[PDB]
Amino acid sequence: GRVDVAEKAMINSRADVNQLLPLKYGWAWEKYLAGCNNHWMPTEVSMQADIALWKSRDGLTDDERMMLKRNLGFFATAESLVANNIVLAVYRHITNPECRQYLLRQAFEEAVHTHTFQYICESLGLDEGELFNMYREIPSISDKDAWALRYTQNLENPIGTPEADQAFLRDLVAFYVIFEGMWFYTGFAQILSLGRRNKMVGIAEQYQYILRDESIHLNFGIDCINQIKIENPHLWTPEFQEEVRTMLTEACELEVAYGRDTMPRGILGLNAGLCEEYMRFITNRRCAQLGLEPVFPETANPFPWM
Template sequence: MLNFDDDYAAPAAHPMPPAAPSLPQPAWTSPAIAKGWSGEISTPAATAKPAEDIAHRRVRVEDKLIINARADVNQLVPFKYKWAWEKYIAACANHWMPQEVNMNRDIATWKDPNGLSDDERHIIKRNLGFFVTADSLAANNIVLGTYRQITAPECRQYLLRQAFEEAIHTHAYQYIVESLGLDEGEIFNAYHEVSSIKAKDEFLLPYIDVLSNPTFKTGTPETDQAFLKSLIAFACIMEGLFFYVGFVQIL
């Protein structure tokens, strides 16, 4: 669930120690560690920071928000949204690969002239035509859009696992098309050539584009609402309606 708590007020910045003169430090380099050209790691005594300063920089649970947080998104712990981490662990335990599924019976049924009716074959090909690109769109929405706006690292971790699941789904559809000996050009271009599939994808694309725009950032009522609309479009309409209708037709 989205958490639209008040913005976290960032602590006052502490002055950075001067960089070693032999090698200017980039912004992302730890102020306490400088790497020389020789590859050796040195820790100059002059750059050591008091223990209280280091503790002050550590992320606290109360600093974390699903969106609009100012805490470091690279520090996974301490957990605030433990449900997200638990879902990540569960998703990893549910790992599978398409080639683990034996397609021999499906291949025999498809090749049998009496195995399926023409209408059943048409439904299967139409749904595959939608699925082969739809999961790519779902992955794009996650990695190019949603992930950028989420500021809780444990939630980001689950999104990365979800994106991999979308890749597995796309792989699975390719595996089915190849196993059944279907026309790859026909199936993979259906989103261009079949008007109903094209219409679904064209409905979804703006919800990817708005989040993947480099200038888009949550933090105002308008942008927070746009972010929520994108989540609804993919989680409810695409996953909950478009996908499940296709699954029911095939099953």
């Protein structure tokens, strides 16, 4: 009574989920190997330059500091939200050992990312309460997290029905495509912009590591949605496609509101309009990766260096 590859599935599989071999989803196994080879620790990056620039007076404009605090405050608790969604929602529904294997890698990388913001907070001497509670004090940040949390909560408060599998797909889109593949990429562009100006390079280097992990996290999650679409064609209905297109649209309006609140006035080489262009370009890119009609007109990448 050993497991055959035909018995294994992304969701609602009857095969023994405790048996890794034989592998069916090689693409999932490949991501796990790539994630492991990207081992890094935030304490490996020196913060001396960033600490000096932070404590100094002329080091950063008041707009740059606020942009930095809002970005850090958003990322500090967002990584925990993604990690909790993996554990409490994604892991249960993916009935596949090799995919769960990568989820364990991804979850741990979220702990490294969370570690990165404890290290930044402790290094720069930031207020822990102000930074980690920022996602309940700032409306622009709170609206983004509350919006993504609903798709996590909806799974927990509903047995393999089409509505159930569609609700799980909404969760994968909200966290892999939107949270990690859109909101984080926009926040990455803001911080890396300072790094390109040789400002807060220690924070920027850690963001480069997080972005490398984030690229695999997104790549895996798109593959999951696409792999689930292959095995469950009945789930990718025209109504659900418009649901996902609508989710991307709201998520962009939440980030526009966030970008405006984070950068009232644009800083050197960065503003809310350019971030609106990048978010609009990335969103269209996510639509193409999901086989979705783009929600915006053709938009160039304002940051081709990302």
